[PDB]
Design a protein around this nucleic acid. Structure first.
Ligand code: 1S0
Ligand code: CA
Ligand code: CA
Ligand code: CA
Ligand code: CA
Ligand code: CA
Ligand code: CA
Length: 322
DNA sequence: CGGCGGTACTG
DNA sequence: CAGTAC
DNA sequence: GCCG
């Protein structure tokens, strides 16, 4: 299926390295080239053929060709030595390239240096203590029991509450990095004030163990990023994301929350090219705030952008099956 | 050459 | 506002 | 990094 496997593996390394150094546009560039190579019907066999692929230009073609002929990629041996440490530090939830570079420059080089000498935000402290647990993907079946816990706790307050698991779960993957749950209510109104009760309920039975992003002073809070752990011996702590949205926002919220990330960016870049704006809240149309278009279902958003409905399993990348 | 998704917490 | 996150 |  990926006929250029030996090429993409090497470019992924290089893309990683730019990403942890904070060269994000260049990393975006690699990421699209790499998907395009995976999606190509045959091995690339010439430079010309490489440039012809959207997402691939002069610089990426040379690397693709160098690799194709010579079997290795030179630049992979001139990667800064800081990269693996920068990666290490960036893998802490709540620390990004800036914090990882500040740590590097303060001279830390391991997690233990971080534990014992770095200054950590509240979030980073939690990311650090659960570093290994958050690095491991969970089986699809564990993700299902996380979703059911949230759903059961919500339906004890109001049985009409609709809870669905999105992200990679809804796109069909066998493992999940974290669970993303979207809650709404078809009556348009009873989603309001839910978090207070739902969080209190999930903390009571011991399920939520730490909160990362949760502005609980707000009665209209709409999101929760935190940490859960299923009951039973030896369970790992997992990342859970919950959003609560009004039903009139359901189609746009579902789309957003299903992702993938890269899919959502391309969908939003597309909408902007047609003088519209796509968010988690709405598809909007004047936009010089413009007006919301009605979108009762995901199908409507796709139609209004001139695309065919894409099944969640096929929402890895927009430009994929094209 | 400049733009590259749009939004929401934290401090 | 910068940083990080989804 | 690539694209318009
Ligand atoms: N930058 C981002 C990140 C995420 N998203 C949307 C919103 C979010 O709900 C959905 C899933 O993102 P996550 O980061 O949870 O990634 P996945 O579920 O695809 O994969 P994994 O958890 O199995 O590793 O994708 C997005 O618009 N923009
Ligand atoms: Ca091209
Ligand atoms: Ca991080
Ligand atoms: Ca997530
Ligand atoms: Ca996820
Ligand atoms: Ca809080
Ligand atoms: Ca440039």
């Amino acid at each position: 299926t990926n006929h250029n496997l030996h090429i993409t593996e090497k470019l992924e390394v290089l893309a990683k390295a730019y990403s942890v150094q904070g060269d994000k546009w260049r990393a975006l560039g690699y990421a699209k080239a790499i998907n395009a190579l995976k999606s190509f019907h045959k091995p690339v066999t010439s430079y010309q053929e490489a440039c012809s692929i959207p997402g691939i230009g002069k610089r990426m073609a040379e690397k693709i060709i160098e690799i194709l002929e010579s079997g290795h990629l030179r630049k992979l041996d001139h990667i800064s030595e800081s990269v693996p440490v920068l990666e290490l530090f960036s893998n802490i939830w709540g620390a990004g390239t800036k914090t990882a570079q500040m740590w590097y420059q303060q001279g830390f080089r391991s997690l233990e240096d971080i534990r014992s000498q770095a200054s950590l935000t509240t979030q980073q402290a939690i990311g650090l203590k659960h570093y290994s647990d958050f690095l491991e993907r969970m089986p699809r079946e564990e993700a299902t029991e996380i979703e059911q816990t949230v759903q059961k706790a919500a339906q004890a307050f109001n049985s009409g509450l609709l809870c669905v698991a999105c992200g990679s779960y809804r796109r069909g993957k066998a493992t999940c990095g974290d669970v993303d749950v979207l809650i709404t209510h078809p009556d348009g109104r009873s989603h309001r004030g839910i978090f207070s009760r739902l969080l209190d309920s999930l903390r009571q039975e011991g399920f939520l163990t730490d909160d990362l992003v949760s502005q609980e002073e707000n009665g209209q809070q709409q999101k929760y990023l935190g940490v859960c752990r299923l009951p039973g011996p030896g369970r790992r702590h997992r990342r859970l994301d919950i959003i609560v949205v009004p039903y009139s926002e359901f189609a746009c919220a579902l789309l957003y929350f299903t992702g993938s990330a890269h899919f959502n960016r391309s969908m939003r870049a597309l909408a902007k090219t047609k003088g519209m704006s796509l968010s988690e809240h709405a598809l909007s149309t004047a936009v010089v705030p413009g007006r919301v278009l009605p979108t009762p279902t995901e199908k409507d958003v796709f139609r209004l952008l001139g695309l065919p409905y894409r099944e969640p399993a096929e929402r890895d990348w927009l430009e994929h099956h094209h």
